[PDB]
Design a protein around this ligand. Structure first.
Ligand SMILES: Nc1ncnc2c1ncn2[C@@H]1O[C@H](COP(=O)(O)OP(=O)(O)O)[C@@H](O)[C@H]1O
Ligand SMILES: [Cl-]
Length: 354
């Protein structure tokens, strides 16, 4: 209706998320931030009408039996949505997520092309993209899978919760399995993927020791494995993986981690200085032979910092290094650069040398 038109306008405004809640106006999430999309508060009556307009008649009946409902909805040639209908304070609520089929380029994402293609070219090993919710981890992964799909003839199996990007077949097969629908869990998906003749396995996130170990093993075996963790940088990411295990297993885990790791890409999305959205702060650890030593040996592991700062031949760099580069280039403010810095001290030192 007008609904379809509003949704379409919202999507064209680059809304990642649409919130329809009684007492507020239609609200969109754009570039990570919620913004109102209209000046009039939705009434309970209006939210319900929107809901009934989106559901199939069968869905409408099962709706009277559920506190919550998760469902797909498509506006042909506009967008695909996953939708969560809820109840709050006697009233229906609606949260719609756009499933995009449009994959940004490395350059669009601020991801160094040469590094990316190098990691994509490996046919064995673990690539970890880390950071908290909203860091662009899904997106880096989607760009990385897309690159593989269009230059390599491979079987790519992804296990996702939920599917954020839809890939079409190009040069590769891309098998995408949604947790809760296609497969029960990351573990279930990872496990049976081992049986489905994959070249590339993407595990959306690792929450178990079981899943972390399985993913490492899969990488050790000879598959290319992509995954994410919530951790802020390489140092924390490495330690977090090990801390998943009982203490008596830890040097086994280092051995396992050191030999199968390829790279860690830790990400933070900072507000752009001009204010035209956001920009990626990115730390790269590449698992060179020397870096593997550092990993395998607990005493030499913090020497990962120095390795990154001098590793630009590979091309590594720390957060504090990339931030300097972003600040001097006028892509972020000094305030934002300093609040983001791993150590706001080592930043100004490093900065003064430019
Ligand atoms: N490299 C990037 N630069 C700017 N914005 C990005 C980048 N990657 C992702 N985004 C945006 O940030 C939002 C959240 O990204 P997402 O990939 O879902 O992060 P995560 O997987 O860490 O939650 C999305 O709206 C997306 O458009
Ligand atoms: Cl309310």
């Amino acid at each position: 209706q007008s609904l379809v038109e509003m949704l379409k306008a919202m999507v064209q405004a680059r809304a990642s998320d649409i919130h329809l809640q009684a007492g507020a106006p239609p609200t969109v999430r754009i570039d990570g931030k919620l913004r109102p999309f209209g000046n009039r508060p939705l009434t309970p009556k209006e939210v319900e009408a929107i809901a009934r307009a989106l559901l199939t008649p069968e869905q409408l009946e099962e709706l009277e039996y559920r506190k919550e409902m998760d469902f797909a909805y498509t506006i042909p040639g506009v967008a695909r949505f996953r939708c969560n209908l809820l109840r709050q304070r006697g009233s229906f609520g609606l949260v719609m997520r756009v499933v995009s089929e449009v994959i940004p380029s490395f350059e669009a994402l601020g991801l160094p092309r040469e590094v990316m293609e190098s990691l994509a070219a490996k046919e064995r090993g673990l690539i970890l993209v880390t950071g908290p919710t909203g860091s662009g981890k899904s997106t880096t992964l989607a760009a990385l899978i897309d690159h593989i799909n269009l230059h390599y003839a491979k079987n790519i199996i992804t296990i996702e919760d939920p599917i954020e990007f839809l890939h079409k077949h190009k040069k590769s097969l891309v098998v995408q399995r949604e947790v809760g629908l296609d497969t029960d869990s990351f573990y279930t998906g990872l496990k049976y993927a081992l049986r489905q003749d994959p070249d590339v396995i993407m595990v959306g996130e690792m929450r178990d020791r079981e899943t972390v170990e399985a993913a490492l093993m899969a990488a050790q075996t000879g598959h290319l494995v992509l995954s994410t963790l919530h951790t802020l940088d390489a140092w924390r990411t490495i330690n977090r993986i090990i801390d998943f295990f009982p203490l008596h297993e830890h040097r086994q885990v280092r051995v396992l981690l050191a030999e199968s790791l390829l790279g860690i890409l830790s990400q933070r999305l900072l507000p752009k200085a001009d204010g035209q959205g956001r920009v990626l702060a990115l730390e790269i650890l590449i698992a060179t032979p020397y870096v593997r030593e550092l990993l395998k040996d607990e005493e030499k592991t913090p020497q990962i910092k120095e390795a990154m700062m001098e590793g630009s031949l590979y091309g590594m760099r720390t957060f504090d290094q990339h931030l300097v580069e972003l600040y001097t280039e006028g892509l972020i403010s000094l305030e934002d650069a300093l609040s983001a810095a791993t150590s706001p001290h080592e930043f100004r030192l490093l900065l003064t040398k430019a």
